[PDB]
Amino acid sequence: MRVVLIVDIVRQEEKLIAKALEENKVQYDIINVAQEPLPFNKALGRYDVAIIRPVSMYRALYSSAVLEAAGVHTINSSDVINVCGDKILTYSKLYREGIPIPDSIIALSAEAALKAYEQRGFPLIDKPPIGSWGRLVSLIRDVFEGKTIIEHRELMGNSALKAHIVQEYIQYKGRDIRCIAIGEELLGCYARNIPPNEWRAPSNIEVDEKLKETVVKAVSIVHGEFVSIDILEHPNKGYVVNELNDVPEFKGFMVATNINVAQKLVEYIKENYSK
Amino acid sequence: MRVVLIVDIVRQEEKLIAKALEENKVQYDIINVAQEPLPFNKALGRYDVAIIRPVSMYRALYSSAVLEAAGVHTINSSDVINVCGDKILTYSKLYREGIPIPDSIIALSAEAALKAYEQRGFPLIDKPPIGSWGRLVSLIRDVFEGKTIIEHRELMGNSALKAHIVQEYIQYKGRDIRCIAIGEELLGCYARNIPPNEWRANVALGGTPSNIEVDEKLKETVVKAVSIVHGEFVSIDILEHPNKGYVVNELNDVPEFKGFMVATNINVAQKLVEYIKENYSK
Amino acid sequence: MRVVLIVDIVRQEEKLIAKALEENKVQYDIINVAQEPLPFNKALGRYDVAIIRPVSMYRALYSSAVLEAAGVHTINSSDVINVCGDKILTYSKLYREGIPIPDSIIALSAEAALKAYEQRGFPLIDKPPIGSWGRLVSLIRDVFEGKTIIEHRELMGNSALKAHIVQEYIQYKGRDIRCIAIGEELLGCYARNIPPNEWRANVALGGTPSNIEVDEKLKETVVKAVSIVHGEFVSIDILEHPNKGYVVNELNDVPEFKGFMVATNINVAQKLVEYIKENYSK
Amino acid sequence: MRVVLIVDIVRQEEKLIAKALEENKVQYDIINVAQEPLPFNKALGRYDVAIIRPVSMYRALYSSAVLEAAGVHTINSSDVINVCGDKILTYSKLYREGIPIPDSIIALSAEAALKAYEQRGFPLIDKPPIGSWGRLVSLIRDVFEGKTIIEHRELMGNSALKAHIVQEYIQYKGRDIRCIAIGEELLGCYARNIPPNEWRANVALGGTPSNIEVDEKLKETVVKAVSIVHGEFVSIDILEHPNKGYVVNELNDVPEFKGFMVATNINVAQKLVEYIKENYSK
Ligand SMILES: Nc1ncnc2c1ncn2[C@@H]1O[C@H](COP(=O)(O)OP(=O)(O)O)[C@@H](O)[C@H]1O
Ligand SMILES: Nc1ncnc2c1ncn2[C@@H]1O[C@H](COP(=O)(O)OP(=O)(O)O)[C@@H](O)[C@H]1O
Ligand SMILES: Nc1ncnc2c1ncn2[C@@H]1O[C@H](COP(=O)(O)OP(=O)(O)O)[C@@H](O)[C@H]1O
Ligand SMILES: Nc1ncnc2c1ncn2[C@@H]1O[C@H](COP(=O)(O)OP(=O)(O)O)[C@@H](O)[C@H]1O
């Protein structure tokens, strides 16, 4: 077996993954896609599998696609990256399967956004389908607030930042739950509590079964191989899926959970892509 | 059976589909997604089939995704819109199956782009993955031009534009060939010649549409390509290549067809509505 | 005397100005700066006066500047357009002279902005220095709202949008007052009332206009403000304040006047052309 | 006398200016405008002089303007920042006075840009009026390259980044000359040479910085330029020209000087502080 690790900005995660490959005696090399171009050639086919780690979605998407063209299986796959990287696409797969999500209405213009606000009532959450580190997630309390948010989103220099995901405002336990799965296997979860005085959110949490099931069904449906899952507790739904990440960070995960994520990843790869 | 026609900007094409639905006695609604929101609900499940027609790529993608959540059969589907809407994703699928494409190198940074230019030599073509009416398709003559184009695309606000498709510059037949397929069957093709003061063939620049005699090699290229990407109602842009015969350049997942109609005499909307009636009524 | 009329989008205003020039028998040409380039040359010196009417601020600024280079007297001048087109610059000049403005704090970063909010308390108005038809004028009710607004403006293409004007929220007469001055003489004023229910009175969708008796306090406020900015043909936007009486909100250096005319029955174009003849004929 | 030093990102230059103030026994405060908001008041009037050093134009412009509102003399002033920070406004002031500049044509749309190219002939330089470390300065060799550049600028698509300055391509001695002046006094000049694979001298990794003997024609050119813009502490970028001798390309209102300092051995900060004391002590 030989693996290629695809990176652009090498963080602790990619170092850990590199380190895990070496000491598990896996043949590998690194291609830095911030530095090297990717031909549509046939001899990238020398790798049995690629670990897709670029820090930007377009780099992850396109490097996976190029490697796929050469017959190389990528973790994660280009289709999975396209789904996890877009909340509307993620919500669509989950909703179809009956996996709970925050109650959501999609609006694709300023006019539609106001109508969605009106259909949903206040308070509500409005976020775009892309990015963004808690960015552009707005808690909207009345029509005046909505109208100014609509105007600000309209003037964003990006097209997908203009689609609105209009959601119920979930407030129950004041925390975000993040989990990591390798294949169908849940490694663990930790909780991120909302800081004072915010409305928006690091300790290990014991995973009850209701949580484990929510997470495992979510990964199965998006076909994820190495992903994180962000979960919100809901008073009636129990647990709803908020987000999947197809290039998950795990330094904050490793410290809360004690799980050697990198080791689990390389073991997984050995089991499934060796011969 | 009932159909939703999803639109934002109503063009001749959308009017034609609407009229074709009415004239074939198909129960249809139109939902304008530049005006109305789309809830993730069971209610839209009242539609058996959605005809996805927004002009904007994000609007086609998301309207299709929401309708799919409700169990509606979308033409085209969101995964298909995601692939067709992106030349790198399209080239990736096509290359894997050995369907000819233009020789392409993918560069995802300024540094990587310069390397691709040097690996390839000049002149070359550099274009982004998304689509732009031939906007941002650059004929790069040298390193200076490459560097300025790199610099410009870096500063544009949506990161897909940071990915450079660095391609062979095809010079041969002096035209673009555009075909349409319905349910993986070729309807017809036409050609749009490069106007005399350019090197791109787009309608947005020039060239009247003229019918093409589709040979067997061209027919099979189209069918194989549309089949691999699973497009149910697509157009396919093909370039004639000195060595490869026909290479697939683009697939469009919300195909234009008023130019295609004048060149080919084919009632595209009629054939679409027949195909839907025949395959999704029960 | 020869006049150039500089336009990009021809509105009723520009038609009116062309008519008034023609009807007063003034030699004029029109240059559309969305169509035609402007050389730094001495050729343009054939015009004695330029009337600067492009709808975009940058086109007004730049066309004025190129005309000034050739020695043409521009109305308004580029210096004046730079000042009037920017609320921070305008407020600075007025404040120095003791001309009342809304109480304002300027914040040039996310951190400064949060401090400004907490310094003045809520509700408050937050707007950028650069106009936008009452867009991006936000009524900020709390810290959560200010934080999201800050986050949004951080991510726009124009760095001027990152400067926050953090203002007292004026609630008194439920209207704006717009006046027009030519050569530092007041023509008149009218009012635009806040529609129920908005916090902004802009034409879109500011039903309804009405009229106002200009008292001496309002007249002098307008004259003083227009004189300090050196505006030769401007509109000025005034808010009636419970304590300060009249405060200056904005000057417009390419004033609209279609609505001013319906309200006041004043021939703004005629007054402009007579002013130019009286002062610039030689 | 007391000075306020206005900063946002403290670079060597700012540290050096702070140090010079300290060593020369000058009472001074620092206000970091990336951290603190700026009220309109009378209290900032405690400062006799403000040294405006924010790294971003909007912060320099707006901090200067607020300080001016309080009666504080700013180095440089808001009007000077507005002129120097915009090459069209700079070229306009210089051209009116007969100070040589690169032959320039301003175009304010895609359509005008192509007409400007045709008027200018090839090769030409096209750059926006707003700085960017040689960003978006394009060397255009024919109409195809021109067409793709126009397309890329249109998609920026913010700012004055849509306005084109279309210039003669100057190529004589393969270098840029940069000078610094305090008041009307020229401190000196150095050259930045174009690196083997370039047309710009900024420039990531290039611009090997040679010291340069200031002749009288150069000195006249620089002094006249600084006189017309009323700069108090500026850099001036000059190009050698076969027929014009020297032309002014740029002025900078927040000049960098660590590189200038090492090329000329001029203690810029010291000279600045000496000048402030000499002039603003009272
Ligand atoms: N519908 C919602 N109800 C309550 N809180 C939410 C909701 N959506 C998002 N949040 C909060 O906002 C934060 C960021 O939202 P998220 O959807 O994760 O955007 P991003 O993808 O930028 O991180 C989450 O940590 C969560 O606390
Ligand atoms: N590799 C190439 N060689 C020659 N011509 C090309 C090449 N790529 C694109 N073109 C020309 O440029 C035009 C636009 O290209 P295209 O890839 O279709 O971009 P878009 O999807 O934005 O229209 C087409 O008409 C085609 O003639
Ligand atoms: N400080 C304020 N207090 C109350 N209302 C305001 C304030 N500032 C602006 N407004 C309202 O918002 C509208 C738009 O504000 P304005 O400053 O004129 O922005 P723009 O330059 O885009 O028109 C004004 O008509 C006025 O009614
Ligand atoms: N008209 C011109 N002719 C020749 N070289 C030019 C011309 N304009 C700019 N340059 C070159 O490009 C470089 C950057 O140009 P400049 O006008 O200074 O833009 P910026 O403000 O982004 O630095 C200059 O240092 C000079 O080398």
Q: What is the CATH number of the domain that holds B44?
A: 3.40.50.20
Cα separation values, B45 from A96, B58, B129, Å: 11, 22, 33
Q: Where are any strands of DSSP class E within chain D?
A: 2-7, 27-32, 38-39, 49-52, 73-75, 104-107, 124-127, 138-140, 164-168, 175-182, 185-193, 209-211, 233-241, 245-252
State how many domains chain D has.
3
How many beta carbons lie within 10 A of that of residue B147, not counting itself? 21
Distance, in Å, from the CA atom of A110 to the CA atom of A186, rounded to the nearest integer, reads 40
**Is residue B185 located within the same domain as residue B278?**
yes
Residues of chain B with a CB closer than 8 angstroms to some CB in chain D: 135-139, 141, 143-145, 148-149, 151-153, 155-157, 197-199
User: Would the annotation count A178 as a binding residue?
Assistant: yes
- Sign of torsion, CA C180 C185 C188 C191? positive
Query: What stretch of H or E contains C49?
Result: strand C49-52
Ligand 3 atom 1, closest CA:
C169
Classified as helix, coil or strand, A78 is: helix
**Is residue C192 located within the same domain as residue C106?**
no
- Sign of torsion, CA B156 B159 B160 B164? positive
Q: Which residues contact A206 (CB under 8 A, 6 or more apart)?
A: none
Solving technique for this entry? Answer: X-ray
Classified as helix, coil or strand, A222 is: helix
Q: What are phi and psi of C252, to 5 degrees?
A: -110, 125
Question: Residue D263: which CATH number?
Answer: 3.30.470.20
**Is residue B197 located within the same domain as residue B266?**
yes
Q: Which residues contact A215 (CB under 8 A, 6 or more apart)?
A: A179, A181, A186, A189, A229, A231, A241
The 3-class secondary structure across chain B, one letter per residue, is CEEEEEECCCCHHHHHHHHHHHHCCCEEEEEECCCCCEECCCHHHHCCEEEECCCCHHHHHHHHHHHHHCCCEEECCHHHHHHHCCHHHHHHHHHHCCCCCCCEEEECCHHHHHHHHHHHCCCEEEECCCCCCCCCCEEECCHHHHHHHHHHHHCCCCHHHHCEEEECCCCCCCEEEEEEEECCEEEEEEEEECCCCCCCCCCCCCCCCEECCCCHHHHHHHHHHHHHCCCCEEEEEEEEECCCEEEEEEEECCCCCHHHHHHHCCCHHHHHHHHHHHHHCC
CA-wise closest residue to C12 among C263, C233, C255: C255
**Is residue D94 located within the same domain as residue D28?**
yes
Q: What are phi and psi of A261, to 5 degrees?
A: -55, -50
> Which range marks the domain in which residue A53 is found?
1-101
Distance, in Å, from the CA atom of C147 to the CA atom of D72, rounded to the nearest integer, reads 32
CA-wise closest residue to A186 among A155, A208, A161: A208
**Is residue B175 located within the same domain as residue B194?**
yes
**Is residue B216 located within the same domain as residue B233?**
yes
Question: Are B163 and B129 contacting, i.e. CB atoms less than 8 angstroms apart?
Answer: yes
Task: Copy the structure tokens of residue A54.
Answer: 């670029």
Cα separation values, C17 from C30, C51, C138, C220, C257, Å: 11, 9, 35, 27, 11
**Is residue B26 located within the same domain as residue B92?**
yes
Which residues from A are below 8 Å from C156, CB to CB?
A: 155-157
Question: Are A206 and A217 contacting, i.e. CB atoms less than 8 angstroms apart?
Answer: no
Token look-up 């006066």 returns: C49
- C193 in ligand 3 pocket by Cβ < 6 Å? no
Question: Are A68 and A52 contacting, i.e. CB atoms less than 8 angstroms apart?
Answer: no
Strands A238-245 and B104-107: unpaired
User: Would the annotation count B199 as a binding residue?
Assistant: no
Distance, in Å, from the CA atom of D282 to the CA atom of D266, rounded to the nearest integer, reads 27
Cα C149 to ligand 3 centre (Å): 16
- Sign of torsion, CA D239 D243 D245 D249? negative
Work out the angle at residue A270's Cα, subtended by the Cα atoms of residues A264 and A271, and round it to the nearest 5 degrees: 90
Judged by its nearest atom, the ligand closest to the C-alpha of residue B84 is: 2
Ligand 4 atom 21, closest CA:
D131
Name the residue type at position B52.
I
Torsion-angle region of D28 (φ positive above 0: left; ψ -120 to 50: alpha; else: beta): beta
In angstroms and rounded to an integer, the radius of gyration of the C-alpha atoms of chain C is: 19
Which residues from D are below 8 Å from C82, CB to CB?
A: 79, 82, 89
CA-wise closest residue to B168 among B216, B126, B209, B204: B126
Chain D nearest-CA residue for C45: D96
Specify the resolution in Å: 1.9
The four Cα atoms A172, A173, A176, A180 give a dihedral, to 10 degrees, of -110
How many beta carbons lie within 10 A of that of residue D123, not counting itself? 14
The percent of chain C in helix, strand and coil, each rounded to the nearest 5, is: 40, 25, 35
**Is residue D19 located within the same domain as residue D76?**
yes
**Is residue B126 located within the same domain as residue B62?**
no
Is C98 exposed, middle or buried, given 0-12, 13-18 or 19+ CB atoms closer than 10 A?
Answer: exposed
How many beta carbons lie within 10 A of that of residue C208, not counting itself? 10
Cα A207 to ligand 1 centre (Å): 21
Q: What are phi and psi of A96, to 5 degrees?
A: -55, -35
CA-wise closest residue to A177 among A142, A141, A202: A202
Classified as helix, coil or strand, D29 is: strand
Which residues from A are below 8 Å from B104, CB to CB?
A: 39-40
Strands B164-167 and B124-127: antiparallel
Distance, in Å, from the CA atom of D164 to the CA atom of D138, rounded to the nearest integer, reads 10
Sheet with C185-193: strands ordered across:
C209-211, C185-193, C175-182, C233-241, C245-252
Distance, in Å, from the CA atom of C119 to the CA atom of A254, rounded to the nearest integer, reads 42
- DSSP label at C86? B
Distance from CA of D245 to the nearest CA of B (A): 27
D164 forms beta bridges with: D107
Distance, in Å, from the CA atom of D225 to the CA atom of C276, rounded to the nearest integer, reads 32
Cα C124 to ligand 1 centre (Å): 26
**Is residue B93 located within the same domain as residue B138?**
no
Single out the residue in A101, A130, A145 at which a domain terminates. A101
Work out the angle at residue C62's Cα, subtended by the Cα atoms of residues C56 and C64, and round it to the nearest 5 degrees: 100
Single out the residue in B148, B170, B192 at which a domain terminates. B170
Token look-up 């589909």 returns: B17
**Is residue A161 located within the same domain as residue A93?**
no
- Sign of torsion, CA B204 B206 B209 B210? negative
Single out the residue in D52, D70, D101 at which a domain terminates. D101
Distance, in Å, from the CA atom of D21 to the CA atom of D10, rounded to the nearest integer, reads 15
Which residues from B are below 8 Å from D149, CB to CB?
A: 148, 152
Residues of chain C with a CB closer than 8 angstroms to some CB in chain A: 132, 135-139, 141, 143-145, 148-149, 151-153, 155-157, 199
**Is residue A49 located within the same domain as residue A93?**
yes
Question: Residue B120: which CATH number?
Answer: 3.30.1490.20
